[PDB]
Amino acid sequence: GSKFCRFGQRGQEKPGIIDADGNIRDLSGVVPELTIDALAAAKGADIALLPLVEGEPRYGVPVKGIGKIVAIGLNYEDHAIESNLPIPTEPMMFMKALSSLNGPNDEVVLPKNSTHGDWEVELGVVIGETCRFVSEDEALSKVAGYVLVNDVSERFNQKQRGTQWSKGKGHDTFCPVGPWLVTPDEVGDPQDLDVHLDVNGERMQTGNTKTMIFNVAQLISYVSEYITLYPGDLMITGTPPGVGEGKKPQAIYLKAGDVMELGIEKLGTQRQQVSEWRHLGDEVFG
Template sequence: MRFVRYGQPGAEKPGVLDAAGRVRDLSGVVDDLGGAVLGNLPQVDPETLPLVDGNPRLGVPVAGIGKLVCIGLNYSDHAAEAGMAEPEEPIVFMKATSALNGPNDPVYLPRGSEKSDWEVELGVVIGKTAKYVSAADALDYVAGYTIVNDLSERAFQIERGGQWTKGKSSDTFGPVGPWLVSADDVADPQNLALELDLNGEKAQRGNTSSMIFTVAQIIEHLSEMMSLQPGDVIATGTPPGVGMGMKPPRFLREGDVMELRIEGLGVQRQEVQRDA
């Protein structure tokens, strides 16, 4: 099933898409799409739920995200593009939850930004507490999948010292959605096409089959280092085609439009503006 949260920022309600792609109100079934609900997502016939009028804004499809954990250099072709060796273990960094943004909301370049970049990524939403989980069992802990744009200010990330989190956490730099697709509706998370277009032109193309570390291996690794809680989101890395890897590099400018797609998980669209 395809779950959404719709409405104005801070006042989103839970919903589900029907066969025609229309939003149906789920608030009579669950209070929100977060916490324990994610371990037992409701199985309902969308046609029995109230139809939401118009074309409502879609928010982040998961409520109460506690951690946004990211994996760096997880595609062999992206590592080559960046001129870096493939990691022997997953590269892990955190993205501030204050960066979370609706899938179609504007993205704001932070003050002083000259090297902001795009990254389409498969997002994994944890459904139940995972600690010391084996790769063989890891996917049993997944509530579903979504799209994450792991936006990055490369100068903040690489040239300002410290850790990558500095370049990943600007406000609006974490669009998530549009949908939370339940795990049982994703046949193989290691065979999904990813795409990002910039101003209607091809930028990123890839497939999750090129991941160095699979979703299951990532969950195993992370759950050794920290417990994963219901609603935590893992951004699993990006394929080639980022602006930093272009020759010459091409970074985001005011007025740019990004469109992101992952097979079966919907489409994001963000217009770029500059923060005041």
């Protein structure tokens, strides 16, 4: 067993594992919650003895207890070329507000009066062991698994209200994560995964993680010199070309009624409906 998930309504999710047929099996008999500490027991469990889940439940964020999210800026060489930007010599880092975390298929709500909402399919890395000044040679051994991410962005809030990108990155619902935490033995080389994203069934982003400027090991090593990564932390590693902001002749942005569909090889798929802003009340996402 190498694909883990969390299923059910928000705030009520249960731990699960994806069997060889693609069905969810309930892990509640083995571990109470899918946390990083629970991975060893969930990885050792006998799948054929776990009950099948009924009712076609919602996928939640596949790991409970993500403490913070570190985000990487320009990190695809073919993206740098398409934007006519220089190759960064060290990775741009910014924080992806934890309150943006959402389920993989959950509704994406555009911010108030937003006309610059944008998509960013990204490889997410979930840390398994504390990363504090870790060498590049040892970095990948600190990884618990990989996840599919959409780094949803508001380009006006990101770039036209100051120099700090996080202002356009932390909105409610702007970090769909999942549906699977896939352990490294199943993922293989994280630097050979096909990546894609469509909007309304029209392909917008195509790439492969081989063209990352800083690979996952380089990113973990660098980040750990500035910000300690603890088990459960998520790092989102940048996006290939094809974001709406870069479309020619004119940029293309998200609008109400759009449907985003994205996937990364071995990490499953996401589908989000995009809705216009409304006041989301006392809802606590994640």
